[PDB]
Design a protein around this ligand. Structure first.
Ligand SMILES: CCCCCCCCCCCCCCCCCC(=O)OC[C@H](COP(=O)(O)OCCN)OC(=O)CCCCCCCCCCCCCCCCC
Ligand SMILES: CCCCCCCCCCCCCCCCCC(=O)OC[C@H](COP(=O)(O)OCCN)OC(=O)CCCCCCCCCCCCCCCCC
Ligand SMILES: CCCCCCCCCCCCCCCCCC(=O)OC[C@H](COP(=O)(O)OCCN)OC(=O)CCCCCCCCCCCCCCCCC
Ligand SMILES: CCCCCCCCCCCCCCCCCC(=O)OC[C@H](COP(=O)(O)OCCN)OC(=O)CCCCCCCCCCCCCCCCC
Ligand SMILES: CCCCCCCCCCCCCCCCCC(=O)OC[C@H](COP(=O)(O)OCCN)OC(=O)CCCCCCCCCCCCCCCCC
Ligand SMILES: CCCCCCCCCCCCCCCCCC(=O)OC[C@H](COP(=O)(O)OCCN)OC(=O)CCCCCCCCCCCCCCCCC
Ligand SMILES: O=P(O)(O)O[C@H]1[C@H](OP(=O)(O)O)[C@@H](OP(=O)(O)O)[C@@H](OP(=O)(O)O)[C@H](OP(=O)(O)O)[C@H]1OP(=O)(O)O
Ligand SMILES: O=P(O)(O)O[C@H]1[C@H](OP(=O)(O)O)[C@@H](OP(=O)(O)O)[C@@H](OP(=O)(O)O)[C@H](OP(=O)(O)O)[C@H]1OP(=O)(O)O
Ligand SMILES: CC(C)CCC[C@@H](C)[C@H]1CC[C@H]2[C@@H]3CC=C4C[C@@H](O)CC[C@]4(C)[C@H]3CC[C@]12C
Ligand SMILES: CC(C)CCC[C@@H](C)[C@H]1CC[C@H]2[C@@H]3CC=C4C[C@@H](O)CC[C@]4(C)[C@H]3CC[C@]12C
Ligand SMILES: CC(C)CCC[C@@H](C)[C@H]1CC[C@H]2[C@@H]3CC=C4C[C@@H](O)CC[C@]4(C)[C@H]3CC[C@]12C
Ligand SMILES: CC(C)CCC[C@@H](C)[C@H]1CC[C@H]2[C@@H]3CC=C4C[C@@H](O)CC[C@]4(C)[C@H]3CC[C@]12C
Ligand SMILES: CC(C)CCC[C@@H](C)[C@H]1CC[C@H]2[C@@H]3CC=C4C[C@@H](O)CC[C@]4(C)[C@H]3CC[C@]12C
Ligand SMILES: CC(C)CCC[C@@H](C)[C@H]1CC[C@H]2[C@@H]3CC=C4C[C@@H](O)CC[C@]4(C)[C@H]3CC[C@]12C
Ligand SMILES: CC(C)CCC[C@@H](C)[C@H]1CC[C@H]2[C@@H]3CC=C4C[C@@H](O)CC[C@]4(C)[C@H]3CC[C@]12C
Ligand SMILES: CC(C)CCC[C@@H](C)[C@H]1CC[C@H]2[C@@H]3CC=C4C[C@@H](O)CC[C@]4(C)[C@H]3CC[C@]12C
Ligand SMILES: CCCCCCCCCCCCCCCC(=O)O
Ligand SMILES: CCCCCCCCCCCCCCCC(=O)O
Lengths: 570, 570
């Protein structure tokens, strides 16, 4: 695909003869590969010099007439304001015609850096293409000897031009997804809606409830949290794009190819059917010979095979990007950290239930599950797997904290700043004390120690420090709120990107309620309180917790683009 | 909505200042209404003269350079052909660039012809709007004395210019619906699919089959037939639009607003969801107190209220367009006939099973249904309603033939041509003899007359008469096939529109096959053969006749657009 034929796709035909004719210069690139060698390798560098001057002459002429039009647009605007200083109703209609003229020139300006960047990207593609076609390194230097020094690239006046246009718009003045991809979202949004209703009815009416269903819920709870996250992240990618925050830049995402919000809802929908089908099948058990415990591996196994597929199909381009990011996060100290590394490494800190539930499924299927009985997923009637023996659950529980804490220490040894790179380590180091004091208390109660209640105090004394540490932190720097430049935006930062100010006030209240209760759940599961209360409270809070991470994703990215608090891009 | 802002909506901004500025004159009109009288009328007969000359000067100049560009393209294309007469690879690449050049030139011709016709429409809207705002007839007189004689309207050279453009393209050279509608279509499709599978499973397993279920099928068949027809008609409109057939013209539809295929798919999906819900509810009967027979009334009454709703919401425009067409069709002799009337009155001829089932439902609910028992839709265990007593079934069966015969007679009386306006009369009149002889056979067999088998031979003899009459007719004039000007397209007409001829051959075979069984289906319903065989053969043949009607609709429109066989537009 080579960026070759898709280059001219996002180019207006009015400049068709003017842009780099990438499709043309490939054709005789393969001519010599099918058909002197030094002459054939130099002619392209002279051919690219033909395109060098063609874009050099046009851009400078366009740039010169753009800044001259910047005088003209200036001459246009305040004169309308001077005209402002039915007659005025036509005048602002004439202004709105001028706002169109400013917008078309802004659109005309928009085309100009594309005439630079698309060409600027268009060059390098044909120079490395020449670089393995003829096995040369001069092309890698030709972009340095010509492109990196060419007038159409070195002069960045076009970048600062729209910077004035955007400013003057805010001072004086003030592609859709393919139809098939939109349809498939509806089809997968409909099969998921009805299938849930039959699941509700099947549990209440058909399936019997005398047998304990606790193992079934604690096994299938892992799947639901992932499906909630992917769908909730689909709303996020729509919010960023609509608001205006350039998530394509902060994420260091591929500038050309990216997943729109419609694409995310399709992956969320498809897994929704498979999860619902597996749960519904386990109830009725239509096969009557295939055991019920084989269905959970079919569901989780399918997702794993979906993610790690070599086949260059089914979102293959975007699947490796996650795989590269996931591995770089897990081996945190061995690599540097960017915004992509930080984001995923933190997202796993609110998805800790899935990692825990993986341990339960592994233990249950290997210690307490009988592979000689058809219905084994539902017990006939006290299992180590759902307990905290040896604190194996505590070790996996602290895994998400380990990834971030190591990253912050690694992020300290490249810049040597105690603030805000070591204070961040404090907020992640508190969760280690959260689980340790919990596990020791529960074991002491089981043994019967007199000072068991002493360990209860620390687990409650250390309960609060964890909550306020991450609450005062998320509300001050991650979101950037509570600033001295509040002005009109009282208790807020000076500039807001999202339309309505009530949303910022709404999330401040919500980020406190769901934070003081979440730290109970991450520590309740270690201790033993009640078999019903050991699930009924962990199943009503875990789907709530991922919602908190969803709203926190709305403001961290905005505060990373407005102020660059993270200093990732400098 | 007055065509006012949507005029400028489908106008390229490059000519925005050149088109009529409908919004400004609307505003001055409401300024008048909010605030001399003749002096008002007089000064806006010159105001439209301002746009009269503005568009007169632009169009004639644009057409003057267009025909000069027509000389230019005639200086361009054969020069490429002369250049045609890797070198030739670059030559034909420049040839394709010149085809692109002719493409935006044709786009500019498109811009010119709408700069004529949309401007023409805007004139008539503003003049008529002035005709009730100030209660004057001069505006219509002005649209006759200036618009109807204007240089930009009287000179139709642009139409033949685009004709020449299409001719040269065929000689030498050779908007998407909003995403919400597509998503809704997908949602309804998925819900329908899952509910159908649930219905099949419930029928096979849960509901008991010892009791007779024939009344349920003979009641619920009509909704399925209607839904199938609507979905197939959506596919029909998609095929028409994609092929190039200008169905906007033959149907005399509104040039601006029309129902694209996805709207039809949405309506079909919604009705399918409702029908499936009604059937599934009738199966389980969850309420256990509400009787099972009220669900068909709920479904059919909801459909009726949907079609007759006064509210100007939910496809209101198309809704009353269909209502007007149906009213004009049913009172056939009192009105003239256009393509819409003929098309709907013929569509109703292949949907007779819906009327038959409506009659059956009326009789069953008025004569044999006990309104004092909850479960009555399923008989406990010989019903006059499902029989053919008095030939009420016969008369409702021949109703559509009566409508079409009356329409053809009215067309003949308004034209006085024995061909082709009287052979159609016999083709539609054979059905009366069909049903009369079938009913007489059945009655005589019930009585036990010796010459009942005489009526058997008479029915069988008239069977082939009815079958070949409409089969030869549909294959010769309605489709236009089997023409002497075959040439390469053997057994076909000289010009074909759809891409592949195998479609034509398959449709010929399909029509010949299915025309000999729909007649059996429409003739058995009067006679009595077997309670199982009565229902089964009709139930497996009814959903096929609508498919045959769809495939006939696929070709009748092409034939009338290509040859004007019906002579409706002359
Ligand atoms: C007891 C049984 C219960 C069973 C429950 C099972 C769960 C049901 C969940 C239903 C999921 C529905 C979500 C699908 C929405 C798809 C919308 C869509 O595709 O529209 C995209 C929309 C328009 O895009 P446009 O601007 O035209 O073009 C964009 C350029 N690419 O642009 C947008 O992206 C904006 C509008 C869409 C995003 C905002 C709203 C989406 C979600 C709203 C709430 C859905 C309900 C959530 C679950 C219930 C909890 C409240
Ligand atoms: C092992 C523990 C697992 C626990 C959960 C951790 C994983 C959670 C899910 C993955 C992370 C969330 C998605 C992050 C992406 C959000 C960023 C965004 O908006 O961009 C979309 C991203 C960019 O892709 P794009 O720009 O097209 O490609 C760049 C290179 N050309 O493109 C993307 O959408 C990237 C994400 C991959 C594509 C969608 C996800 C596919 C995976 C399905 C489920 C995997 C199940 C894992 C096993 C679970 C076992 C219980
Ligand atoms: C990857 C996992 C492996 C594959 C999983 C396969 C799909 C999930 C399981 C589907 C099972 C559907 C029900 C099977 C019925 C088997 C019999 C049964 O238990 O029936 C329950 C109920 C009462 O039946 P009863 O009279 O007791 O039967 C006596 C037997 N002679 O009789 C009924 O069935 C009552 C009606 C309720 C049925 C609801 C079924 C809805 C969902 C089924 C699949 C739909 C798929 C939709 C998506 C596909 C793509 C569009
Ligand atoms: C016991 C179990 C029973 C299970 C079965 C129950 C019934 C299931 C019926 C499912 C019906 C689904 C049909 C919905 C199709 C909608 C597609 C759509 O909207 O796509 C639009 C498509 C592309 O549009 P584009 O050209 O991009 O833009 C047009 C500009 N306005 O434009 C188009 O319209 C062109 C492409 C789509 C139209 C042609 C193909 C549609 C139908 C294909 C066959 C469907 C199956 C029929 C039922 C089975 C019998 C074979
Ligand atoms: C009483 C006996 C009934 C037996 C069956 C007879 C009715 C069959 C269904 C209606 C007729 C078929 C539809 C014809 C449309 C095909 C023409 C076409 O492609 O154009 C769509 C047409 C034009 O609309 P448009 O151009 O937008 O508006 C013009 C004015 N601006 O716009 C249309 O789509 C017009 C049709 C209306 C909109 C869809 C239909 C709504 C009705 C729903 C179901 C009706 C149930 C009737 C009762 C049944 C009782 C058993
Ligand atoms: C226009 C009419 C107005 C609308 C009418 C109502 C909606 C349509 C009918 C829906 C009926 C759903 C099921 C009703 C169950 C009623 C009870 C019953 O008989 O259940 C059957 C079976 C046996 O039940 P049993 O255990 O004997 O009950 C003992 C009571 N304690 O037990 C079972 O239920 C077995 C489990 C299978 C149930 C399958 C249901 C699938 C479809 C349900 C509706 C789907 C939603 C549609 C779309 C929603 C919106 C998008
Ligand atoms: O779509 P992708 O998988 O990303 O591959 C394309 C393209 O692949 P094709 O050779 O099959 O067309 C190649 O473009 P060229 O460099 O050969 O011109 C090259 O990838 P491969 O050589 O490995 O096939 C290139 O780089 P990359 O895959 O790293 O992205 C990339 O084009 P883009 O860089 O524009 O995406
Ligand atoms: O949306 P529609 O139903 O098509 O009605 C609009 C518009 O209605 P409104 O007055 O409510 O905006 C009127 O436009 P004017 O002719 O008054 O400028 C007029 O309909 P009514 O006067 O009956 O309301 C006109 O005619 P029609 O409804 O017959 O189509 C039609 O605008 P268009 O003719 O451009 O479609
Ligand atoms: C989340 C990532 C790290 C993977 C999941 C955690 C893995 C490493 C955990 C989860 C369940 C764990 C097992 C659970 C129970 C037992 C029984 C006992 O003999 C100790 C080891 C053994 C066999 C554990 C080995 C490690 C294990 C497989
Ligand atoms: C996280 C994803 C990969 C899901 C994990 C599924 C796989 C890795 C797990 C789930 C259940 C596991 C099995 C559970 C029990 C036993 C019996 C033991 O005597 C040998 C290992 C064996 C056979 C395990 C092998 C690994 C296994 C199949
Ligand atoms: C940098 C430092 C502070 C990080 C420490 C993280 C690791 C080493 C800590 C965090 C949680 C801890 C566990 C928490 C609870 C228990 C249960 C107890 O019966 C034995 C020790 C054991 C199993 C702990 C072992 C050490 C542990 C895994
Ligand atoms: C339940 C209460 C206490 C807290 C819940 C807060 C929820 C409802 C609020 C907090 C932040 C909000 C978002 C803030 C900004 C945007 C962008 C806007 O263009 C569409 C709405 C959207 C996407 C909002 C959706 C609703 C939202 C998620
Ligand atoms: C298709 C259009 C014309 C409407 C449907 C046909 C109507 C007119 C038909 C269908 C069912 C018919 C009824 C069926 C049975 C009987 C019983 C007997 O006492 C004769 C009249 C009566 C009561 C009929 C009256 C006319 C009727 C209501
Ligand atoms: C064509 C569409 C509207 C479907 C027809 C539904 C309506 C018109 C029909 C269906 C069943 C019918 C009812 C069937 C039986 C009776 C009992 C009789 O003593 C009085 C009339 C009455 C009460 C009928 C009135 C009309 C009725 C409600
Ligand atoms: C112009 C002419 C040819 C059209 C004739 C159409 C009408 C009048 C015809 C067509 C179908 C006919 C009916 C068909 C069957 C029977 C059953 C029989 O036991 C009595 C007569 C009766 C009820 C017929 C009466 C007349 C009828 C209604
Ligand atoms: C069953 C056999 C004997 C006959 C069935 C005929 C069917 C399959 C054929 C007959 C005519 C065909 C159509 C002819 C033309 C068009 C338009 C084209 O752009 C897409 C295919 C489409 C929409 C075809 C769909 C399939 C079709 C309806
Ligand atoms: C579960 C039944 C579904 C039946 C309908 C399936 C409709 C989608 C078919 C897609 C085929 C391939 C086209 C993909 C186009 C694209 O990549 O956008
Ligand atoms: C059964 C659950 C459905 C929930 C999701 C419903 C999504 C559709 C909402 C429609 C709102 C109106 C939007 C109309 C816009 C348009 O006309 O294109």
């Amino acid at each position: 695909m080579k960026f070759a034929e898709h280059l001219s796709a996002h180019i207006t035909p009015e400049w068709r003869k003017q842009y780099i004719q990438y499709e043309a210069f490939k054709d005789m690139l393969y001519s010599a590969q099918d058909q002197y060698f030094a002459k054939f390798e130099e002619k392209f560098f002279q051919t690219c010099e033909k395109e060098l001057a063609k874009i050099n002459t046009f851009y400078s002429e366009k740039l010169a007439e753009a800044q001259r039009r910047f005088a003209t647009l200036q001459n246009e605007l305040q004169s309308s304001l001077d005209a402002q200083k039915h007659e005025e109703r036509v005048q602002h209609r004439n202004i709105k015609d001028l706002k169109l003229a400013f917008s078309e020139f802004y659109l005309s300006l928009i085309l100009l850096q594309n005439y630079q960047n698309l060409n600027f990207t268009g060059f390098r593609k044909i120079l490395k293409k020449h670089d393995k076609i003829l096995e040369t390194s001069r092309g890698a230097d030709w972009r340095v000897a010509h492109v990196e020094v060419a007038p159409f690239y070195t002069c960045k006046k076009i970048n600062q031009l729209i910077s004035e246009t955007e400013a003057v718009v805010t001072n004086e003045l003030e592609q859709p997804a393919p139809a098939w991809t939109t349809f498939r979202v509806g089809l997968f949004c409909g099969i998921f809606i009805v299938l849930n209703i039959t699941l509700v009815l099947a549990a209440v009416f058909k399936l019997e409830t005398d047998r304990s269903i606790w193992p079934l819920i604690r096994i299938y709870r892992g799947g639901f949290l992932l499906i909630e996250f992917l769908f909730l992240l689909g709303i996020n990618t729509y919010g960023w794009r609509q608001a205006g925050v350039n998530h394509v830049l902060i994420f260091e995402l591929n500038p050309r190819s990216n997943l729109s919000h419609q694409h995310l809802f399709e992956i969320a929908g498809f897994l929704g059917i498979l999860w619902c089908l597996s749960l519904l099948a386990c109830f009725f058990a239509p096969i009557s010979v295939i055991p019920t415990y084989v269905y959970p591996l079919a569901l989780y196994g399918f997702m794993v095979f979906f993610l790690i597929n070599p086949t260059k199909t089914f979102y293959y381009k975007s699947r490796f990007w996650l795989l590269k990011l996931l591995f770089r996060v897990f081996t945190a100290p061995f690599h540097k950290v960017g915004f992509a590394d930080f984001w995923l490494a933190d997202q796993l800190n609110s998805l800790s239930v899935i990692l825990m539930d993986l341990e339960y499924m592994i233990c249950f299927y290997s210690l307490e599950l009988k592979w000689d009985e058809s219905k084994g997923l539902l017990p006939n009637n006290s299992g180590i797997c759902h307990k905290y023996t040896y604190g194996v659950r505590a070790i996996v529980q602290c895994i998400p904290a380990w990834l971030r804490f190591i990253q912050c220490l690694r992020r300290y040894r490249d810049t040597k700043r105690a603030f805000p790179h070591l204070v961040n380590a404090g907020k992640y180091s508190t969760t280690f004390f959260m689980v340790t004091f919990a596990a020791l208390y529960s074991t002491h109660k089981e043994r019967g120690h007199s000072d068991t209640m002493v360990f209860f105090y620390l687990w409650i004394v250390f309960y609060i420090i964890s909550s306020c540490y991450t609450l005062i932190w998320d509300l001050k720097m991650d979101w950037g709120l509570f600033d001295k430049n509040a002005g009109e935006n009282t208790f807020l930062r000076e500039e807001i990107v999202y339309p309505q100010k009530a949303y910022y006030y709404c999330a401040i209240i919500e980020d406190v309620i769901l934070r003081f209760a979440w730290t109970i759940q991450i520590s309740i599961t270690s201790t033993t309180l009640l078999p019903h209360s050991g699930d009924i409270i962990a199943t009503v809070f875990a789907p709530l917790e991922v919602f908190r991470r969803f709203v926190w994703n709305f403001f961290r990215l905005e505060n990373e683009h407005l102020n660059n608090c993270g200093e990732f891009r400098a």
